[model samples]
Structure formats: C-alpha cells, structure tokens
Target chain A: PTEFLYTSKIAAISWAATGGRQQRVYFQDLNGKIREAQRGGDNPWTGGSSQNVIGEAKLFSPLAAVTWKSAQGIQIRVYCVNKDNILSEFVYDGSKWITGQLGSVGVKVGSNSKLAALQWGGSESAPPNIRVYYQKSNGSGSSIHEYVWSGKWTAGASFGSTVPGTGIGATAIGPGRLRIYYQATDNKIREHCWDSNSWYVGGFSASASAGVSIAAISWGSTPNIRVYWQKGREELYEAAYGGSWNTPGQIKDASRPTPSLPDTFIAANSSGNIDISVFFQASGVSLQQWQWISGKGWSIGAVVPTGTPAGW
Target chain B: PTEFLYTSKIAAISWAATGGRQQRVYFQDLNGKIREAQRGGDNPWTGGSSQNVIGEAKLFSPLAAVTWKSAQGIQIRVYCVNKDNILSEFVYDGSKWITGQLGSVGVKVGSNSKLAALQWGGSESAPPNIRVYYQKSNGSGSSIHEYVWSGKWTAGASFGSTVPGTGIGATAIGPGRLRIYYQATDNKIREHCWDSNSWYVGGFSASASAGVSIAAISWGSTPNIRVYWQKGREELYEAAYGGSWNTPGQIKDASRPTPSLPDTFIAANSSGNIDISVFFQASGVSLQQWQWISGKGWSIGAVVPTGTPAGW
Candidate 1:
C-alpha cells in the first residue's frame, strides 16, 4: 500500500503468531521521512500499514530492525538516526506504535554512519539483551561505539579505529555468542566476535567492495554464520562458516536480479524450513526484495512500490 | 498498494497531463469507509494516496467517479451515499482534497441504491455541467432522481419507475449529448438520453441479470456507446452501438479472469489509442481490474490489494 520513494539502506523482517502474520520493509526517503511497506499473510505488500514510521530521520540514514518473541507476544523494533544525527528507536509492541531515543538528546552519531543492532538471549522464558553498533569520530579516524540496553541504555566499550566511514553488520547466535562484520581499507571483510570469555578479531574469505554495506545472519541446524556483500559490479556474494569459512560464492546472477546499488540488508527465521529475505534499492530508486527458502530455492518477494520521479 | 478490502461497486479512472500521469480506483469497505487505490506515472497502485477518502458512507453504498480537465487542471470527483443515506461528494482539485454535500443535509438517498454521475460541456472555454442519477422509493415502486449542477445542485426531474432496485449507469459525449442505462423487471436493458432539448427512452439490445450492476462508456473516433452487464453465471457481456447495437458478446472468459461477483464498472479516454478499464470483485472479496487498449487487447491492471479475513 505504500508509495513513498526511498534511496537509503533497507531493513526488513517477517513474523507470524497464532492469529496473525506480517512482513515489513523499512527505509528512508530523500525527504528524510522514515517509511514502511508491509503486508499480512499472503497479501501483497502495500504502503497501507505505515505512511511514516513516526518522524523524519536524516536523509539516507542507516536502518536496522529485529523481530522477537516477547512477554507480550511478537514485537518489532526499528533503529535509525534522526536529522540531528541522534539514535532513535520505533517499536510495535503487538498492538500499537511507540518511539524512544537512547538519550534525552542522544550521543552524537557520525554522519552517514552504518548501524547494526541485535537481540541476544531472547526467548519465551526470558527477556532479551539489546545491542547497537555505530561509528564515532575519534580525531583523525572513527572508532566503533557499542550501546547496550540492560536495566537501562548505556554506552559500552569502543574499538576498531580506522576508516572514518565503514559499513557494520551484526548477528547473535546465543546468550554468550555474537559477531560483527565490517570492511577495512584493504577491502578485506573483517569480523569481531565474543564467546563467554572475551572478544576476538578475524577476517573472512572474500575481498569486498570498499565500504559496501554488509548483511549478516546465523542459520541452520548445525549453527552457521553467513555474511553477504558485493564485489565491484560482479554480483552479490556470500561467505559462510559452519566449522571454518567456506569460499565465498556469487548468489545474484541472471536468474536472481541484483540492483545497481551495492548495499544489502537481510533477515531470517525458522518454522520447519528456513526463510531468508534480502533487500536492496533497484534501479530507478525503487526497493526490491529477494527471498530464499530452504528447499524451494530463490524467488523475488513482493516489491516495495515506489513513486520516485522518472529518471530518479 | 491498497490494502483496504472492498465489497461495494468499484469506480475507476486514469489520466495523464503534460508532466504527470495517474490511475485511481475507488470503493467502499464494510466499515463504511470510502477508500482509494492510486498510482502516479507507471508506479504500482498503493493505498498510500488516500487511506480514507473522507467520512463514513452507507454500508455497500453505490460509488461513482469521474476525472476531468478543470480550470485548475486535472481533477477527480467521487460520489457516494452517507450512512444516513444523504448524497455526499469528495473532490481532488489538482492541488489538495476537499468535500461537499448535495444540499444542506442532502436529499435522502435510497438504501442500496446504484449511482451514476458524469460531467459534460467541460473544457478550457467553458465550465462543465454535472449530473447524478439514483433511485428513490415511491409508494409501491421507485422513481429515478436526476440531480444536476449548472450553478448549484438541484433536483431536475423524476422518471422511470419500475423495479425499485434496478441498476443505473451514465455517460456523456458533448454539450447536449448524454445517455443513461438501467434494468427493467422483465430483465430487459433500457436507455434514456438527452439531446439539445428533451430526454427520450429506448430499450438496449440485451437481456441482463435481474438486478445486476451496469457499466457504460463512449469511445472511438466514429463515436460509440457501449453498455455492459452479466447474464446468470455467464462471463461479462457488452452491447455496443457504433451505427447499431453490435451483438452483445462475452469479454470475460477462460483467458480474461472474472470474479465470482457479477458487478462491473468502467472508464475510458483516448490518448493516441483508446484505453478501456473495467473492474469487478474477484473471489475472496478482492477488487480485480481488467484493462483493454485499442491495440494491446486485454491485460490485468494493478489489483487493488485486499485484507479480507481468510475464507471470508
């Protein structure tokens, strides 16, 4: 039902409960408005759900979203940076929409900073722990800033100083396990992870497009980590590790169209079979969605319709 | 992009100017709300344009719409009956949205009445005159009510008494040339027209479903008047008069999908080649659009997405 035009990075999620089902895609437009394209069950995606997700965010702002089983039922959370470059959050707690900011004024977020957020240790029995990552200018270069939500929101440790503006990707596997991915100046995909013990660093198998946005997910019965990115006009590529890193391979080809834009965002959930949803801005400033089912293979999802002026 | 489920009769129109192009579909939902499905240029139709056209209308109230070139440029008007059964109108005057009523409280409209509205004599040199037709209950039967707007809304005359709930359809070709079609108790189709002087009555060429909804349009350089309806379980049938009534034929068949519901609404305009658009409710309570171009034949338009409960 949505008709808003978007050119920013996309954030998408899909969920179902005993009585309802939903799929939502979020992105920012040139006008700085935060918008959503959503649908229920097998219906087509329309802008009918949310015209504006609340207020305007910075133009081309980074976006991140997560859906989890909560005490109140299934809830969705979306994070973005406002026009003033402050961290803001929008939540749909089963019934209505609400919003909040990390601080009264919020910590100053870097311009065009990429955002990565996740909820670890979440289940029907206990509440989840939320973590968000972004970059903060530290003089000549920028360092990663970690924001944690325990009993309250607080700033955590900062590390990995290098490129002033690099993309970030995050995902959590269990209560004590989490991983974050980013691109370095040498175009190598680097990773930072945590066990029950301490945080460690490593690099993956593929050479990525310099500063190309990254999308990461953990799926499968044996537990696997898959990170996706693009290599200069080649196609979409993925690097995975079950025990060790698998050679990265091209996933986007003539059979599955890839956008002219290099940025990628992802989401996944298991309900007998796995469902993987990926989003990118196609040519003409339209948002395109591609879905991969565990056994059914890849197919295009309902497109998030756009009204960008011709030649945009 | 529209997510609103529609059960009432549909009203659709498409238009293009030097710099802009649009297609819009209007209908009523069970909640009594009037909603629109619209798109600009070649974009997909989403409910994003008008979630709610205005106030609540009678449940299953008849709907009629027209797009015309006004002094302010391209404009659209939608007519419906309020919950209290009062005639009401909504207009998009090129720049913003506005609403109006036929009278102070408006004339009392018949329950479940079918409506037909049109604009004639409209151009850059002159303002158009508007006419709307509906039925009003008499002691034992119903009479047609002709509401006209020369300078203001006024009841013109009442005529055509027979089956109280028969369907109504109207179209105009020029300053004093207009036509209206309706059904009779014997399942016969009838027509009433306006010349420079008086209104005359004649019977159309086909037998129709007792009280089936009717859609009519005038197109082609030679000038043609086409009236369409259904005949018990058969696909859509149309009767045309270019020189004479061209045998009523089935347009909806094994190739062109028709809804289990029999209602039909139509619109047409010449832009180099003639374009004809028709609408009906597909099974599952969804709105379906079928379009025919002079050279392209028939193809489905962007469907007005529905959210009716599953199995409803």
Candidate 2:
C-alpha cells in the first residue's frame, strides 16, 4: 500500500529549530493558537494528553518557531504577530509556557507573514541571542527582532522595505549572522540580513514563480546552506549555497506526488544528517508531512494531531 | 515628518580608496570617467572639490572594487568592463595607479553585469589568490567567466553554455568556490557555480519575472552565501543560505518607497557582517545607492559619480 507524507494542521510549519535533540514540529490550528508535535515515541502526538503547546494567548501571524538553549533548559520559542501586529511570543521554557507581547514597535504584521527564529552567538545552552524576523502588516517591510535573557528584546531591522507577499523564514550562520527571506509583490523570493556589523538588504529568488513557502537549514561541517520551497501542487523545488547557489531540483517522498499547499513549510532536523520534514496541505485542506530519515529516504505521509486546517 | 530615501544616478556605484579612514566612495561618470566621494569628515559630499577618481583612461563597466596587500602598503583594485568588455584593472597602490587589462578573452560585459571580486584560497592579508567574475557580452548565454592572478591573469573558459538574459552577478564562497547568477531568457534567475569540483547549474531565483540586478556575499567563518535582486519597482527581494537558502522577503527604505530601478547592483565589504550596498539608476538616470549597515538600519538614498548610467 502506498502512503502519503506527514502533514501539518495549518499551512505553516517550523522545522528550523536550532534547539532540542528531538525532531520537534509546530503548527497552527484552524480555530485558534499554536500547536505542537515531536518525533520520538511510537505516537508522539498521542498520549501526551497535551498536544496544544501554546495556543492559549490567541496569536495569528503565520507561526514560526525554533528550539534553542536557555539558561533554564532547552526551550522552544513560538512567535507570531498578534491581531495588533505587536510580536506575540510563546516560550516553552523546557516546561511551561511564558507567553507575552514583547514591545510597542507600532509594527503590524501581515496575516500571511510567516514567523521565524534563529540562534546567534552564545552556546546552545545559553544561546547568545534568539532572533525573530517577520513582515510588517503595512506592507512596509520586515524587521529582525531579537530576544535575550534578562528578558529584554531589541528590534533588528534589515529588510527595510515592503513585503508584497507572505512566506518568511530565517537561518543563523556562524560569525554572528542571521539571514532572512520573504516573498515580494511578484511572488518571488527575496532577502535581508543582520551581518556582524549591519543589516544588509537585497533579493535572491530572482525567478521561479508560484512560491508559496520556504524553509532553510545548514548541513555538515562544510556547512553548505540548503533551501527548499513549494510553489504549487506537485511542485516542490530546492536550491543550496555551497560556495554559491545550487541549481534547484525537484524530488519527492518516495513515489508520492508533491503536496498541494502553495505555502508549504520545509525543515531539516538538527540530528546532524539530512533528516527533513515538509509540512503541507492537500486538496482536502488537511495538513500532512513527508519526512526524510538519513539514509532511508522519505517516510511517506506523516500526519499531525487530530484536526483539519483552514485552506490558504 | 517622514523623509524619502534618496536614489542613485546609475544602477552602478563602486567605492575605491586604498585605506580609507573614511568610507571612501567611487564610481564611473556618464562620459566614461571616474568620480570619488567620502562620508564622515565634517563635510560628506559637498566640500570635497574632488569628484574624479580615475575616468581618465575612459573605462565603463559597472565598476567592481577590492582591497588587497600589494608590494606597497595596502592597495585597492578597481575593475571595470573596458570598451571591449575585457577586464581592466586599476590599482591604487599607495602613491599612484597601476593599470592593465589582465586578460585577452574575446569577452565583454552586459550593461548590467556587476563585476565581482573574491579571495579564493588564502587569508585576507595573505590572500593565496584573488578571483574575478563577470558575464560575457558575446551573448552565448551567461557563463561563469573567471580571472585569477598567478604569473598574470588567465581568462577562464565560458561556463560552457549560454545565459539567456543580460543581467549577471557572482560571489566567491571561499575554498575556491564561486557562485554566479544571471537572468534567463525568460527573465528567470538562473545560476551556475564552480565548487571545488565541477560547475553546477539551476535556478537561484527559482521564480521571478523582473530579472534586473543581482548582489551576493558570503558571511560567517564557514562562509554562507546570501544573494539579492530586483525585478520591478518596489520589487527588491533577497535570499540567503547559512547551510541553506533563507525564505525570500521584501523590505523598503522609508519615504523613498522602494527604488524601481528594475536593474540594480549589490556588494559587501571584506571584514564581513551583512553590510551591503545596492547601486542603481533613479528616475533621472543617475547612479544612486541603498546601503544596509549592520546594527544600524539603512543609509538611505546614496549616489554615485557624475554621469548618466547605461540602462539595465
């Protein structure tokens, strides 16, 4: 019997978590807040008696989350632009949820703006900085907002422009840098960054349309950066930057057809191999995922917690 | 009160000065001459009485610049596409200028081909080798053309095929790696890169319509590459790779909205970080720039030398 890949509840997914040893996954529910699912245990989502990680505070910006080191323990920070566009952050401080709206930046996040987090500087146990990036609702631009202990959050601005479309993401490289990307008015992939010294701006995705979602992660000691995005049904493409950008190619989870979500979220786990998960939606608007297990290829049709998703 | 970001005269601007205690800026003029400007000193642009750096030899390729240690103190290499599209080198080594056309490849550059410089093998001060990249005007498709210094400059081969469109740019990702991106005939962003091994190809833009200009830089100790480009007005976009491509996004400069130059150029400094400069033409057809300083936001509306730029 053929199986489809794993999927998410909402079209959004967070796999670029630079924290934890587990293959943790996060998403949004159709009615409300943030949801969670992990990779261990025969049925991780089940029996936990608690799959709803942080939907309590009522947040909406396309969910972006990451697992990183905190003085307390390994923690996961879930971010979104609340109805007010102010940053809504949920920190799974290894145990309970500490949800709060960080600032008064007067910034509004687009309903479709995807949320992203990366670790910069510091150690995994005490990440120097936890960075968050999102698109402004005013269609003005995106900002690099940061969170550190002592619990003070600083605003990081780079993509000093407007985001025509949604689908946002970021990755942290060594040497204290965070790279961010988004979709432009033309649906093309674009970028901005916080280098060691400043926030640089420009575009990277020049062509290839139907861009709906993007996910990125670094791989190996060579540390080549790999990126994957979904355009349309049966249309998943990926590229990489080893010394430069690699030609994008299309592949699938086993013989399964491509997932149908235009804004599909993809992520590479930090287990040290090419382990990956692509959380997407189908014709029925169901969130599903396709997972890659190192040398074993892809494990088809990974499902999410019990629920359906609102179609994008 | 809000201020609009200023625009550049040409889509091309280069900064040249051996060792600048100041942020020394330089570019080519309309009449095929060189111009200079420096910021910081009490009087930034006005009181300089100086505007010509080295247009005397009649050069005009979107200028590319790099600083290296010559036999002298610290020298700056300013490269341009000569009338023949041949790579011309102008070195401001301490006292005067050392000029020469390093190669004889029957190649030239497209109007929007932004010349690029990179340190391939060795350390910065003790650079083992320096690499140069540009497009071929022969129209055989955009190939990965490179020039290196050994006993002299040797013109590298055509990428072996053709790039469909006109605009092109390249970045050196360290360890003898060079990545190049160009606009395909369909105006899509296509790419070809030379890893430590063979040349690879695919779409970097992955999806785009307005393929005007491209800018690229590599950050971190491991050297992750980031790229940006512009398609239509307010259409500037960017992508990055820590280990992979970050989601693409669009941000704008205040008051300035987003420059609709369509055609643009991008570059980064040697010490690293995300510091970036984008040069392009304004409505009046002169060269202007948008620079992103790390930590600090954007240095809005900067301009280049004294001349109308060739349209991209």
Candidate 3:
C-alpha cells in the first residue's frame, strides 16, 4: 500500500479502522510542511489538509508515523525533522493536536534521516507500551536507534542498525514481536525485529534489490512479508516464511507512471479481504493510488483526493 | 522453529541438522546460567541440562551459539562475555569444549540486551565467514553495530542504526548478502542490508503496530522473511520482497489462548518441506506452531515440546 507521495526524501503516516472501516494517511511536503488525508466507507478524500504549516525541511529527514487505539481513543503520531536538526513529533488524539521534541542524545535528524514507531504492550489490562524508533542518537549514519515509554520515556537505547540515509517498514508480528524491513548500505532490502524481551536484527538475503526506490508491507493474519522496488522500470522482490524470500512477482502497476525514489508510500487494509495500495508522486503534482482488492486483483485507483502538485 | 526461548527476556540459541534430523537449543537462566537441549529421530526434549556452567557474568551475553560440520564431526560454537567484556567464544568439536575471545569493539551481554549469531562464508574451498552483529561499543542505547572476522576481526565499521533498548533479527540472504531488520529511530521496524560491497537502509512501511513483544523467522532455500507480533489476540505481520505486504490472513489458532509478549520466538526447517513454529510463555511457556509442508496447506501442529512454564 503506497500511502504517501512526495518529491525528495519521502515519508508518511497511516492508520486503519476496526474491521477495515476507515483509513487515514499523512505525509511530508518538500516545504517542511505536514498534511493529512482520510477516507471512510466508500467516501473519497476531501482533498488533503495542512496538519502543520512549519515542520522539518526535506534537506533533513523524511517523515514517519504510527497510530494506535488507546483507552482515550485512537492516536495518530507523526514525526519529522524540525527546521534542520531537531526531531519533532505531532500527535492527534481523535480530536486534539499536540507536539513535542525527541531528545536524540545530541545527534540531530538530517536531510535524509527518518522516523517510525511501534506500540509494544500486551492488552487493555495495561496502559500503553508506546515505543518509538528513530535516528540513532550517536548519528553513526547507518544505525536507527530506539526509545520506549512503558510509564515515562527512558533514555534512548540501541534498537537496530542499517546503512545511512533511509527510513523503515514495520509490522507487529505477534504480541511484543515486531518485524521491520529497510534498505541497507547497498540499497538492497534489510530488516530487524523485536522479540519482546530483546531485539534481533538480520534479513533473509537482505540486499534484496538495487532499485532506485523501495517500499514494503506484511500481510495475512500470521503475515507474509513483501518488499517492492523501482529500478529500470518497476520490478519487484518478495518473501514469505516457509515458501520463498526475495522471490520475483508482477509489478501490479509496472505500466503506470511510477514515482521517483523516496517519493512513494504503501499501505493496506485486509480484514480477511485484501486491499493494498501505493501512493506516489506521478506525472502531475497529484496524489494517485494503485490499488488491489481481494477478488479484483491489482489496478490503478483514482487520483484520490485529486489535486494539483502541492509544489511537487 | 521457535529458536531461542528463555525467561526474563526469553531467548534461545538454536542449531538444526542438515536434513532436520536433529535440533539443538541453548539458553541463559536468571543467574546468567547457560544450558543445552537436544532431540533426535522423533524424540522431543526429555531433559534440558547445562552442558557447561560456571561461566563469567557481567562480561558476557548469556545467549550465544553456532554449529557446523567439521572433519571430526558436528561442531558447535557457543559464546559468553568475559570479565573485561572481551567476547568469549566456546567451541565444542563434538568432543571437548574450548574457548576463544572475540575481538569486538568492546560490549558485553546483558539481562536486557543480547547476542545473536549467523554463519557467513565461502565453501569447503575456503574458511567459513562467521560474522556476529552486536552493540558496536556499548550502551549507545541505540545502534547494535557489527563486527566481523572475515579473516581477523577487522575493526567494527558503523554497522546499523537502531532505536534505544532493542536488539536485532538477522538472516544471511545469500553470499555477501546479509539482511537485518531493526527498530529504527521511531521504534518501528527498520532494516539494513549488506550486498557484499556496501549497505542499504530503509523498510517496507516502518510504522506497523503497537504490541508488547515481537519475533521473526527467515525461511526457504533462497530466504523468505516472516515476522509475528501479539497484541489483543495473537496477530501476525509478514514480508516477501515483491509480493504482498500488510496483507492479512488468519492466525490458524485464532481461538486458542494467544502467546503473550516477550515470550514468542519463531524458527523454520526449510529443506523442501517447511515447518515454522511460534513458541511463547503461555499456560506452560508452551509451543504453538504454524507449519507448512511442501504441498500441504499452512496448518496447526500438536503442542510442541509439550510442557509447562519452566522457570518462566
């Protein structure tokens, strides 16, 4: 599901409702601005809205997001670089909007840094074990660090490692378990996982592709992970536990006008039925989605929330 | 294949036979104790015992293991942290136990942190490329950098970025292609890949979920990736480059008591037939597997290692 579309370094925030009732998406504009779009039932987007006017710049890091249904309600969290360095977070709790800063132990976000999130708690019996992963505070360039707030935020800790200048793809595999995919120093896909007690990092033949750009998503109840990239045209690479890793697949939308590197995002909604989509900067400064449904398979959707390039 | 399952940060160190004939598991106890368990033919774990105790704490990480077939026979290499945080590698050449110190950049194992092993190398024509990924220096809170002994342990280069407090999951995709999944700056799953030459860092879609625990598995001859996490009811997320990401399916045991966070682990036996199992601390720190034979559909297996909470 490509959920966000942009020019330079791309990034996004997305959410799904109970039983696939609704989906929400967010992304960063080249002007260091943040915007949001949403759809429910068969409703179309009311265009996109400016969530925040001033945000981090594209020369810094891309944007990242996560959403959860807490006791207070569903919460949407968006993170991006502030101006040139600071890591900034924008939070929306069903209705309220808020903001905060992440203390990265001195290392600041960059023109190419990124942010992603995980909520690592068990159930309603507990508050919320909200954990956030971002640029390594040490700024070694190739590492992505972590911070968790069981009660209050503890200092940052080493979460995983990777090449310099990229973001991540995440999915909750089981309780206290998370599996993430990313690009490494060589532009091939890589990954890291959280097993409640500790973190384990590795990839199945990571370095999956040398495409100009990449995106990912994990599907199924007991999920099957898939990574996609666009190189000489949009080819693909895939993986599923027990069956294959880095397997080749049809580019569902290879014929469509694809986005440039770091300007596409993917998202999905499968409440037993599958609905995968990819949003990217196409020919016009437009928001387009190449969608796939259960029986219908893959095809290009509408110019969702149709509009002119927000300075694409 | 629930590789490592211990208490606290329940973890396991595992090894499998060339043809799934036998399996070996190693783990750490509260006192930072270590033990081994094995089963052959169709025999399950009857008694798990300490092959060696009286190991150094404060200097070594409890979870350490590696196995290979040598001229003498099957050999296993287990590890422990030494007094000076010197990496100690214990070897069992199907006969005696020997030890050697890993020339790491300097970092120890911990109750909260850990160590995972992967065998990298050439063929019978050349020596094995045994590489280990761990905290580069120590407590950066984020960034489980890497060190390798391609020939001699060359100094650790900037391995990967990470979120604070998380470890990692790794897989040797192919020769010179090591892919790792990690928690990025936002606590979302991120990854890094090594393509023999350089590295790549990014993810499918980093922000996946909010759960307490996480587990991962890399399967098949080529290397297919799968990750599982448990939240409300046991749920899962998976990935396969070029395939479906965020695609949903059924948790074969949707009605069964789910595995709690911090207690789940997954492993695979991919020699044509694939058997992947998810183990967690439940009624008895029991085992539940989602297995797939070459032609059979994904099905639930019998209560594995059928037992009760062992010190969990």
Candidate 4:
C-alpha cells in the first residue's frame, strides 16, 4: 500500500496503482556512466547505447490493479542521440516492460529539440490527459511546439502551431490544463497554458529568464499551480496561482556558483506545502531544496551532496 | 498511522509514526517555528528548533488523555542542543500538559556542562535503553551514561564515568553496545565501544579529534555499527565494523566553505547499502548523505538545504 521510492528529477514525477501496490520510479541523469553496483540494485537504469544516452525518465500506471486489457499503464519518454536526436518512450506492465512498446519521434539535426515534460490523469470522471511539449529546429531557427496524445502516441494532435520560444519547462496543471514556460530568443521568459481545448499565453517576465531551471506543483481542488525556478546565481524564484498568477517572489539568494550545466528541476506537494529539489552542477554535482508556505515566502532547503558523475 | 514529528539539528533530521495513527501528538517549537505543515494547515516543526535555540519544546497530552490511559502514546526527546547548554522535555495528551514531564538537565549555574546526544530504543522482547552522553565543563570533561526505562526512567548507570576528556560524540549501536568517541584532553581522537557488558578501548589518532561531532549507524543483524564525524574543516571521517579507521576523506573542504557542523546522523541498511544522512551547518543549514556500497567506500549523496526557518 506504500510506494516509498517514487522520485523523478525532471519537471514532474508521479506514481499510481493498477490494483495491487503502486509502482514508483526515480530518475537521475547518469551521464551514461553506469555504476557497476547500481546495475543490480533495486532500481536499475536500462536502455543506454553509446550513441544514445538516457536523458529524462518517468514511471506510470493505472489507478487500480486490473487485467492488462482493463489495465492502463504509464510511459517514460527520454531524449537520446543515436543516429539523430529523438524522443523515445517506454511503457510498463505491472512488473516488467511490455514487449515492443518503445517508440521514438525523430528531430532533424542541429535543432536542440527535446521532450520537456509528460503528464497523465486517470478516469472518465477524470479521464487521463497526455500532453507532450517539445522544441523544434527549422532551417532558420528553433521554436517550441505542443502535441496532445489522444490515446495515440504517433498521431498526437497539434494544439499549437508554434510557441514563440524554445520551451525548457512544461507541466500538467489540472485534468486538462498544460503550462509551458520557455526562454524566448529575445531573452524574455514566456509561459503558455492549455485548457483541454486551446492554448493561451499565460504571462511573460524578463526576470524569469534568470532562472536556470523551472518546476511546478499542483496545489488545490481546481488544481491551482505553483511554479519555481532558480534566478540569477543562487537566488530562487516562485510564482503561484490560487485564482490567478501571484507575483513571483525571490526566495533565497545564496550567491553560490550555479551548476555548470543545470539539467533537472523537480517539485512535489507534500502536506499542503510545496517542496522542491533541484539537480545542478558547480565544482561538482549538487542538489538543493526549497519549501513554500501559505504566508511565508519560499525558503531554501539544505543543500545535499549529489555526486552526479561527470558528463551527465 | 503517523504520530509525532521529530526534528534534530544534529546528525540526521527525521519524523515518523510514534506508534499508531491517533497516537499522534501535534508539535511546534516555542518560537512559532513549524518545520512541517500537516493536513489541517497546522505547522509542525519537523525540523528541530530554530538556529541557536537552547532547548527542545513540544505540546503534550492533557490530564484527561493521561488519566484515561490514552496519553502515554507520544514521547519527544531532545537529541542535541544548539549551544550545548541545557536540555528539556514535555508531554501532552489531547488537552493540557502532564505537569511533571517538563524539566531541564545539564550544566546549571557555575557548572560548565553540555548535553551531547540522546538515543532511545526498545522492543517487546527486550528492555528499553535510554542513554545520554554530555560534555562536562565545556569539553574539559565528558561522560557516557545509560538508564533502563522498563516502566519508568530510573537512575542512570554510568558507562565512562566522568571521563577526563571532551566527549565530542556518542551513539548506541544496539541493546547492549554503546560507543563513545572523544577529543582527549591532550587533543587526540580516542574511541571506546561497550560490548553489551564492558567498555573496550579501541583506536586513537590525531585526525580523530578533527570532527566537530560524531554519529553511529547500526549496520547488520548483530547491530554492527558505522561511525561518521566531521574532521577539521570539510573533511568527513568514517569508520565501519570491518574496516580500519581512516584518517579522513575530503567530502568537502576549504573550497566549499559554508559550515559543516556534524549535527544529526542516521543510517539504514536497505538493500545492503548503508545510507546515512548528516545534518550540519554550512553557509546556511545543509545535509549531506552517504551510501556505503560494498566496494565504493562512502559515496556522497544529494545535498539538501537545512537552514533555520527556511531550510527545515
């Protein structure tokens, strides 16, 4: 009845049951270096080729245990570079991988195209919604795009033709609302939200571009959303919505050096408080956390040592 | 069935079920500092007291709960103090204080004494053990003491009675084994372990006294132990059951100056890896975790921010 090990390093992480115990997943950038010891550990990293390195990982499943025919599962999407840059998917049954379910979407060369986030909900009273946002490269430049997985992965419906920036972060707000935040080529931070039917510009801030990463957590009944990102240096920034977007606040500014190549940011709602953890690099690997209370502003969590291997 | 929220500024900070669900007691530090927000928006300071607080505080069950025999449910202990000055405790039923449960122990006026570590453990098959080790007169003298709490707290039994050295750290390995590591009056690091019956002096080295604090984690079935402490600046010292005492390994040194106060430390042997988290004070409060893999020595873990007010 308890899934104690579910964790993800990217934008959002989730766990659910089909009928029996819920399956949990933890994701970290291994930098393609597999510790011999970790390979046989409880959670093992799979599917890594020299040309294609594992990028982001997630775990998914149904709300209750059921037969495979009635059992809905979860999928993980990873960005890899084998023959070319592509986004890949892995689906899971109750205990193991379903055969031949891996799929990939190709991106033309030179485009820094990658999967930003993946989210799902389970029920008709609350039918699951899947949204995949990615950045694309044209002969001229790169831009963000959105696709809805209406039960078919390859035949996703394009909700937005083109978002005005390169999307770096995307998250699911409610049953159908999807938010995507990105840094515009013009250096402005921009956001877009999808409400089941259409996509609309949420807001933009020049200050947000200072963030090295962004993460979001759902807060209330209507699934109000709170977003967090790292501002310049060691500063932290947060924006939330009860009825609407609250002004962003500067949480902490330790003035510590930013990680060399910040790759992942994650936030979770635990007991009404928003808890966030980030994976970054400085002289070496590092992780930090922040918590947001109702009245109190965002506070920085203790920095824990994350010995991420090099090249991650 | 979660009960009390436990917070410590020492080795490792934690919160878990005291015994049962309703066995739970709401807790908050006197300074209005709540470390965690529970289901009802009530602030529970799962993080220990705010920076530099002298004692531990809690709201206990009322007389009705205690008289009806419902109050012996929750127990809170102050494992470490900020300035090593005084120690205190309290208990509450559903209503008011149990009166005599509130008290202080340690250096009173004139006498220079400081409480170091407090540990408690028991089982249905065995008697309970409550142990406290403290420094007398500001590291001028130290001692390790134990008491049995089969039914109630009794006079303590001394292990190393008023040893003429600064006992920097002490921890219980199991029912009968207690380990004490101290900075000799001569400034050398010395260690002693009590094997269920008597104390046996072990290793000594110049680097032993390097740690600001020491913590021990139970390892195997017989409750073998591993000890971790801070050595000098950023160097962390670790000793395991089957290994020789290492001088010190540089987890973080001068280059990474915040402050590394070896506060709380805890170890769990899940899947054969001994995972330990050390709470310390650096630039702000932070925590570092290490997992002892079979051949990898002690690999660093994610750094978590654990400063006061914010980093709880």
iRMS per model, in Å, is 19.9, 23.1, 23.0, 20.6
Estimate, for each residue in A1-312, the C-alpha lDDT of model 3 and write its tens digit. Answer: 121222323334344556444555555443335666666655676535444332433332456666666667767666666544665677776577677535343435544455566554423355666566666442333676666666666655565445654546666655666766666666666667776566676556454443234555554555565555444224333344533464545555555433422223343323224455655554333565556665666677666553232211
Q: What is the C-alpha RMSD of each candidate to the true structure, in Å?
A: 13.7, 24.2, 23.7, 21.3
Put down candidate 1 lDDT per residue, B96-170, tens digits, no spaces: 768865636468776757788878766656776889888766222566788898878888767665465667778
Docking class of 2: incorrect
TM-score of 3: 0.43
Runs of candidate 1 exceeding 4 Å displacement: A1-312, B1-6, B19-21, B48-52, B101-105, B138-141, B231-234, B255-257, B262-272, B306-312
> How do all models score by TM-score?
0.48, 0.42, 0.43, 0.38
User: Candidate 4, which CAPRI tier?
Assistant: incorrect
**What's the C-alpha lDDT at position B187 in model 2?**
63
DockQ values of all predictions? 0.01, 0.01, 0.01, 0.01
lDDT by residue for model 4 over A131-180, one digit each (tens)?
55555453224555555555555534333333232335666666666777
The lowest-lDDT stretch of 10 consecutive residues in candidate 3 chain B is: B1-10
iRMSD (Å) of candidate 3?
Answer: 23.0
Order of models, best lDDT first: 1, 2, 3, 4
Alpha-carbon shift of residue A37 in model 4 (angstroms): 14
**For model 1, which pairs clash?**
A1-A46, A1-A47, A1-A48, A1-B1, A2-A46, A2-A47, B1-B45, B1-B46, B1-B47, B2-B47
Residues A1-312 of candidate 2: C-alpha lDDT, one tens digit per residue: 001111222323233344523555655442334556555533444211134546532323356666655577666666665555555766677678776545444455554455666765544555456776665543434433444333466655545443444555677756565667666665567666666677777435645564466777665555566666776455666676776776777757545666563333554434445555666655343445666666565554556543421110
